[PDB]
């Protein structure tokens, strides 16, 4: 373990702050670390406070990869992140090459499609959403997003971002893929012609679109759209947060998309 | 159709921006006002951008109710706005008296409680879905917020916050209301007993609550929980956001919340 200052270990303090250095990246949490390394993301070194148990199976996880893991005592812990208190554990893990269409079709598990959503807090809670629900991955278009490992991204996502595919594409790109792939697009709308609650019933690999607006999202995905799917409230004149809308999606499938795992 | 100053109409230039009092405030975009003045709320006066249709209807509900309504030119609609921009129909309102357990227990359907939820944008979002699932009304216990008026809960919400009822409360004074209710309480939690899709089998009206830890809620509403309800995920190990979890646990009471209305 390491308790001093530094040591050769301020690479941590470098990857951490506003820095600048894209190259690597600080993943805090077990869970994102665990799921990180299971997408193959790269890790220099990962390491533990050292007045919290450090998970067995992290530990194991990152024997059988050869991963280093190194302890550090509370004070310099401490001194590090604050004030979310501790990540009480972490590691330093290099970038990886932006996501791909490829990535998402040797997955398995329904797509996730956003259109116009901008806001980085739902683009977020999307990622977490996703993930736990068994998305195999997630199609940004017009998003503004420029790269993933955006720290408000990777913050807002409580680091699940790398977890899985996360593919920045221009509507067209998209559409062609999508089409070619055999997927089936379903576009949820507060005025689909289908009830969500349907969305169990069907056997094929979906790719379930999402807009930013009620009117969202493009009329022009409406082409390559199979059918509405819509999410029964009180009236159909309301609507609901397009991250919301997703996990009841979602959890209507899980059964389809654990199937497909 | 006004473009004088001070015309009068001045009151949204003083009631809309943060000014002295606490009392009357804005409401932006359509749908906010329908609900509001569905509700019970006073409105001064609804206005309206000149170069953009208005929406025939809100005159209905605004001529039964004696509130006036104004037109505005684009020049002068948006030399008081950004965005959208097209927030397009709003009007000023006086905040109605804060929330009682009573406005809860007379209306009908499940009711949300939130424990040591603080982060606003959550609480909005949770507000819009608890609205349009039909929610009787949310208790937010340790929110630390103030007053339902502030104007961050208000834009959080789109302007919802008034079309039910919301009751902040102590940890306590909520436990002894849900008790003599009648009310079956069920807390949610990745790792409760019974699951979520089972809910919509429970006859009996009910009350969910909602923690802001993964370790939340406070165990000191066990006693009066009769039941842990848990969301099946790819894995009990991780968590869904706080309004996430909130939207599929309404979804499956859709039902008997359709049924108490
Ligand atoms: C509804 S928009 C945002 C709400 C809108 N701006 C409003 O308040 O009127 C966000 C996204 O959630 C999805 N969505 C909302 N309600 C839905 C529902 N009831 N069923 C299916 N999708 C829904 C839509 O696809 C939309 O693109
Ligand atoms: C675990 S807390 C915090 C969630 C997440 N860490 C966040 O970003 O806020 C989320 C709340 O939603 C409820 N919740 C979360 N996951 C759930 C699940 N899998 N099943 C049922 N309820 C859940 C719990 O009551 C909890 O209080």
Request: glycine fraction near 8%; charge should be negative.
């Amino acid at each position: 373990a390491n308790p001093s200052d530094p040591a050769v270990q301020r690479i941590i303090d470098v990857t951490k702050p506003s820095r600048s250095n894209i190259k690597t990246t600080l993943i805090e949490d077990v869970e994102p670390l665990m799921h990180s390394i299971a997408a193959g993301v790269e890790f220099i070194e990962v390491y533990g406070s050292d007045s919290s148990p450090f998970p067995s199976e992290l530990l194991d996880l990152c024997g059988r990869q050869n991963i280093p893991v190194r302890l550090i005592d509370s004070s310099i812990v401490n001194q590090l992140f604050k004030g979310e208190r501790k990540a009480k554990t972490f590691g330093i893990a290099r970038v990886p090459r932006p996501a791909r269409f490829g990535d998402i079709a040797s997955r398995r598990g329904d797509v996730v499609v956003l259109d116009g959503v901008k806001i980085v807090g739902n683009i977020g809670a999307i990622v977490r959403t996703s993930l736990a629900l068994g998305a195999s991955g997630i199609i940004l278009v017009d998003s503004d997003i420029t790269s993933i490992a955006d720290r408000r991204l990777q913050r807002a996502s409580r680091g699940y971002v790398f977890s899985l595919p996360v593919v920045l594409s221009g509507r067209e790109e998209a559409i062609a893929f999508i089409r070619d792939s055999g997927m089936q697009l379903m576009t949820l709308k507060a005025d689909g012609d289908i009830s969500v609650k349907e969305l169990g019933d069907n056997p094929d690999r979906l790719a379930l679109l999402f807009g930013s607006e009620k009117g969202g999202p493009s009329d022009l995905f409406e082409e390559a759209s199979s059918a509405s799917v819509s999410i029964p409230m009180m009236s159909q004149t309301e609507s609901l947060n397009v991250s919301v809308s997703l996990g009841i999606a979602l959890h209507e499938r899980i059964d389809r998309n654990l199937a497909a795992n």
